[PDB]
Write a protein that binds this ligand. Structure first.
Ligand SMILES: *[C@@H]1O[C@H](CO)[C@@H](O[C@@H]2O[C@H](CO)[C@@H](O[C@@H]3O[C@H](CO[C@H]4O[C@H](CO)[C@@H](O)[C@H](O)[C@@H]4O[C@@H]4O[C@H](CO)[C@@H](O)[C@H](O)[C@H]4NC(C)=O)[C@@H](O)[C@H](O[C@H]4O[C@H](CO)[C@@H](O[C@@H]5O[C@H](CO)[C@@H](O)[C@H](O)[C@H]5NC(C)=O)[C@H](O)[C@@H]4O[C@@H]4O[C@H](CO)[C@@H](O)[C@H](O)[C@H]4NC(C)=O)[C@@H]3O)[C@H](O)[C@H]2NC(C)=O)[C@H](O)[C@H]1NC(C)=O
Ligand SMILES: *[C@@H]1O[C@H](CO)[C@@H](O[C@@H]2O[C@H](CO)[C@@H](O[C@@H]3O[C@H](CO[C@H]4O[C@H](CO)[C@@H](O)[C@H](O)[C@@H]4O[C@@H]4O[C@H](CO)[C@@H](O)[C@H](O)[C@H]4NC(C)=O)[C@@H](O)[C@H](O[C@H]4O[C@H](CO)[C@@H](O[C@@H]5O[C@H](CO)[C@@H](O)[C@H](O)[C@H]5NC(C)=O)[C@H](O)[C@@H]4O[C@@H]4O[C@H](CO)[C@@H](O)[C@H](O)[C@H]4NC(C)=O)[C@@H]3O)[C@H](O)[C@H]2NC(C)=O)[C@H](O)[C@H]1NC(C)=O
Ligand SMILES: Nc1nc2c(ncn2[C@@H]2O[C@H](COP(=O)(O)OP(=O)(O)O)[C@@H](O)[C@H]2O)c(=O)[nH]1
Ligand SMILES: Nc1nc2c(ncn2[C@@H]2O[C@H](COP(=O)(O)OP(=O)(O)O)[C@@H](O)[C@H]2O)c(=O)[nH]1
Ligand SMILES: [Cl-]
Ligand SMILES: [Cl-]
Ligand SMILES: [Cl-]
Ligand SMILES: [Cl-]
Ligand SMILES: [Cl-]
Ligand SMILES: [Cl-]
Ligand SMILES: [Cl-]
Ligand SMILES: [Cl-]
Ligand SMILES: [Cl-]
Ligand SMILES: [Cl-]
Ligand SMILES: [Cl-]
Ligand SMILES: [Cl-]
Ligand SMILES: [Cl-]
Lengths: 466, 466
């Protein structure tokens, strides 16, 4: 038993004890206040609580690294990623391409870059589940009509040709067992749905994944994102060079302010301050554990006016941004190679930051977060997102299990019993989530701490030949 | 690296994260309320916060046990105490008692039983440090003119006689190096002071103790209490008998309400309710982890009126008490053998409880708390005390170290910089403590979480011969 482990655990315990003593002390005081004195005092309370909370959180972090837990998790995360990448590659490069089973995916989904990247990921996962080599057709890709190889390495070295002795539009893994080439539709109209979808992870990796990663769902998705966006030689140079021209050095917090056409239709408008509170709050967290010389925010946005506004409102922050990329993402010029390379770099630097603040309603941010999973052992927690929790457009039902019972205080809350299964609609980031208790078919709010994430598994192939 | 360990660590992180989301949300709501509506809501807040916090504490308890941490901690705590007991016994039992170095301690200090026991502990500790066998003179003991052996086995089987070729009153370990038998005075007039006092622990055990125990000072003191209170056969039988007759079964929470003469001069009067909140809060905690069939409180008091009052106010709690022991402790009849038997038994059952609630200003509670240390691996946190932090009457300076800087918000607070040394006067159990910042010599309040306990060591002998 390790001595730092025990000292840390004991300080995390006592930190909560003093936080609770303090909570009681100051709430009893607040009950007897009014007006300006109540607001002054409640605001000071929150300041003090913030620093308290950040000290507990910092101690928990150290606990996560002590006793070589840091070394081990990294080692084990590396071995897992190498294994899945070895299996994906093995699958993607059959010896005999004319005689290989194939899954044909077409990149031209009527949406944006991240929505399309995710369509190729969803295709890729099903190809991995069905043991079919992925044939990505990318001619006339609206962003770069040259095709996928304009920016990224092709998904296969040996098998890029979609030909075979029998081809058919998908109809089930059972029905298609002897169709050589299967054309796969977008998840929005897939029928029947195979088991090889998010957020389920492979049965065979699941135990190892839970030991290491806080959200094995995102980790599994990220494995295909990683392989896909393997970059062309010139793109690797463009990214490396742009890293130099921009002042991009860690410690940096990545921020994605998505506006333009998303507002109103798929997500809300959020002011810059709504993002920057988490940025400052999480620089404060970082500063408790390392030296923070200047507070750098990498700012990815499609509002070109934002950069000037942000710099004036936050004069202590160095803002790293490529405002001309921001202009390139405006709609009049959005679907062009110049813009595509723009969003690929913005997403890159987002994924590379130490922490991410954004809206998970955007496919752009979600990909940044997915790519982030591949650059650390467990980067599952590295975001204070503003609206949706994580999801994979097309996933199966996202379920939780209640672990503590809850009795509804108002009519807007649902009751929970331990074991009850709750499908979550979202987290409100106020201590409550919204969801349906499937047992009683009632929808409402429940205290977010009272549920446990239900990890789902699938019997995927294990490709032992790699 | 362990899987239950990692799931647990992440839920403590996530549970604390949701607690902060909740704290921010509901405090912002409170800022805009008035009077009765503010009070309704603030009280509901506190109710919810309690259960949130108790869930975090429960996961922290479980983390304390996973990966066999529990099993190992017990074994190591067992090995330590067996070693210290083997060393004390060796010292107390020379082969030639006529030629042994001896330290003469006199039990009849002008105070009560616990204060006298603690005087004998201080003598024992100094005798251990100087390698002198403890000769405990106890005739005319105010509690039992029969002597120490009225209740307890003698502190030595071979060496109980105080004779030697040179005897003298203490004058320092260096000056007395060749006086065979040294008479030790009460700590109140010990001069010079030797290094062998609380709250310092032996140099060689300090690393092993910190791996195991949350308050190594108490663990070291309890080691001597343990050796001291080995009871005579009738008393051992009396304890077993009273255990059956009172119906003492775990889960039981010990409560010690000290009143009579202690009020006004040495401590405050506290209503039964001030104790019973911590009792319920902690049965609520226990109930989160085990079955609580009946809520048992063991009640030690010198107020014989309390038992009837308590039973009436708390009709859900089974009160295990010996009201006549409460009567035997009354002022007019306190210093007799039957009374001494009362307090010894009251202290026994207190130490035996799953948790202790009391005033540490009373030596009676402190002795129970010290004895409690020898019945569990780390039982240092098993109290929600009502005034003083733990201390040993006569001790050296109790120092903490500031670990996070603090700037004083009002005039009652002291400033701290990390590394600053804080002499602690006590904890207010409201999130603040009182103390002196020695570097700048200022006295005041500081947030209790911003300090770290300063463990002090002393080079004690190691008695290789056992
Ligand atoms: C055409 O273009 C687009 C690309 O731009 C292509 O991409 C698709 O675009 C949409 C929009 O982004 C994506 O839909 C989103 O899905 C989110 C995930 O939903 C699934 O999982 C959820 C939890 O993680 C769970 O809540 C859902 O039940 C759902 O899970 C489904 O479950 C089934 C089993 O039960 C499975 O079999 C299904 O497969 C599975 N479904 C999916 C999608 O896989 C979802 O959370 C998100 O909803 C939020 O945002 C909605 C706005 O789009 C909002 O709608 C508003 O609702 C309110 C009241 O309900 C109403 O007053 C208002 O007027 C509505 N606004 C509009 C315009 O509809 C939702 O209510 C919901 O709100 C969120 O609520 C939570 C909790 O309160 C908050 O924490 C949060 O703040 C809040 N979010 C926001 C920002 O408002 C949304 O539906 C889709 O995933 C994506 N698809 C793909 C495949 O990538 C599209 O594919 C292109 N089409 C074609 C033909 O190619
Ligand atoms: C006669 O019989 C008695 C048996 O009872 C024998 O035993 C002695 O009994 C007394 C009282 O029962 C014990 O006194 C207590 O000492 C506690 C420890 O003091 C040491 O450690 C402190 C930090 O923990 C440190 O700050 C102290 O100065 C001291 O540390 C010293 O350090 C020195 C180096 O600088 C060393 O060289 C010394 O060796 C070492 N000294 C000692 C004493 O060991 C102490 O915590 C405790 O103080 C609290 O309780 C007081 C009441 O007893 C309370 O008094 C009030 O003071 C305010 C202003 O200060 C005054 O206006 C008011 O009138 C007083 N009110 C009352 C109720 O009387 C103190 O304020 C203090 O308050 C505590 O404050 C914190 C935070 O503010 C709260 O969390 C807490 O609730 C609160 N406590 C209470 C109960 O209110 C007390 O002084 C004594 O230790 C013990 N000595 C021994 C050696 O056994 C005695 O031996 C017999 N004598 C003879 C002739 O045989
Ligand atoms: N370079 C850049 N482009 C963006 C940004 N936000 C949106 N875009 C552009 O808008 C498209 C958004 O489409 P999509 O990937 O489907 O994400 P979503 O509409 O926000 O859910 C991206 O592919 C980019 O062309 C940004 O922050 N930086
Ligand atoms: N049996 C019994 N005796 C008590 C109790 N509380 C106080 N006394 C008596 O009062 C004495 C108080 O002396 P002491 O040990 O110095 O404790 P203190 O005065 O509270 O610090 C005890 O030793 C007992 O004689 C109690 O709960 N049970
Ligand atoms: Cl092959
Ligand atoms: Cl299928
Ligand atoms: Cl760097
Ligand atoms: Cl600023
Ligand atoms: Cl499960
Ligand atoms: Cl399956
Ligand atoms: Cl395990
Ligand atoms: Cl040992
Ligand atoms: Cl000897
Ligand atoms: Cl007397
Ligand atoms: Cl000395
Ligand atoms: Cl006997
Ligand atoms: Cl029992």
């Amino acid at each position: 038993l390790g001595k730092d482990h025990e000292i840390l655990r004991r300080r995390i315990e006592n930190g909560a004890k003093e936080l609770w003593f303090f909570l009681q002390s100051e709430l009893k005081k607040l009950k007897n206040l009014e007006g300006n004195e109540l607001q002054r005092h409640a605001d000071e309370f929150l300041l003090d609580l913030g620093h308290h909370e950040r000290s507990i959180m910092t101690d928990l972090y150290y606990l996560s690294q002590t006793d070589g837990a840091g070394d081990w998790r990294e080692k084990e995360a590396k071995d897992l990623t190498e294994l899945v990448q070895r299996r994906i590659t093995y699958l993607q490069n059959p010896k005999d391409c004319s005689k290989a089973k194939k899954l044909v995916c077409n990149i031209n989904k009527g949406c944006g870059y991240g929505c399309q990247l995710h369509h190729v990921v969803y295709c890729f996962m099903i190809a991995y589940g069905t043991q079919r080599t992925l044939i990505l057709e990318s001619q006339n890709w609206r962003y770069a009509t040259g095709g996928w190889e304009t920016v990224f390495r092709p998904v296969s070295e040996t098998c890029t040709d979609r030909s075979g002795i029998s081809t058919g539009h998908w109809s089930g893994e059972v029905k298609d067992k002897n169709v050589q080439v299967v054309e796969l539709p977008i998840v929005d109209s897939l029928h029947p749905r195979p088991p090889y979808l998010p957020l389920a992870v492979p049965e065979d990796l699941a135990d190892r994944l839970v030991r290491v990663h806080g959200d094995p769902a995102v980790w599994w998705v990220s494995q295909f994102v990683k392989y896909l966006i393997r970059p062309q030689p010139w793109l690797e140079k463009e990214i490396e060079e742009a890293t130099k021209k921009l002042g991009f050095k860690h410690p940096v917090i990545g921020v994605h302010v998505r506006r333009t056409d998303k507002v109103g239709t798929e997500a809300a408008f959020h002011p810059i301050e709504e993002y920057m509170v988490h940025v400052e709050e999480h620089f404060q967290l970082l500063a408790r554990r390392m030296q923070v010389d200047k507070k750098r925010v990498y700012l990815a946005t499609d509002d070109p006016s934002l950069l000037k506004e942000a710099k004036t409102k936050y004069p202590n922050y160095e803002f790293i941004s490529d405002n001309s990329i921001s202009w390139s993402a405006g709609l009049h010029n959005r679907y062009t190679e110049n813009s595509l390379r723009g969003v690929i770099l913005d997403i890159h630097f987002l994924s590379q930051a130490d922490f991410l603040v954004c809206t998970f309603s955007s496919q752009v941010c979600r990909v940044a977060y997915e790519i982030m999973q591949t650059l650390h052992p467990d980067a599952s927690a590295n975001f204070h997102s503003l609206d949706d929790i994580y999801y994979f457009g097309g996933q199966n039902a996202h379920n939780q299990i209640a672990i503590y019972a809850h009795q509804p205080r108002t009519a807007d809350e649902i009751p929970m019993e331990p074991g009850d299964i709750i499908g979550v609609a979202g987290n409100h980031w106020d201590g409550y989530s919204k969801g349906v208790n499937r047992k009683l078919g009632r929808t409402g709010l429940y205290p977010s701490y009272k549920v446990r994430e239900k990890i789902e598994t699938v019997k995927y192939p294990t490709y032992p030949e790699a």
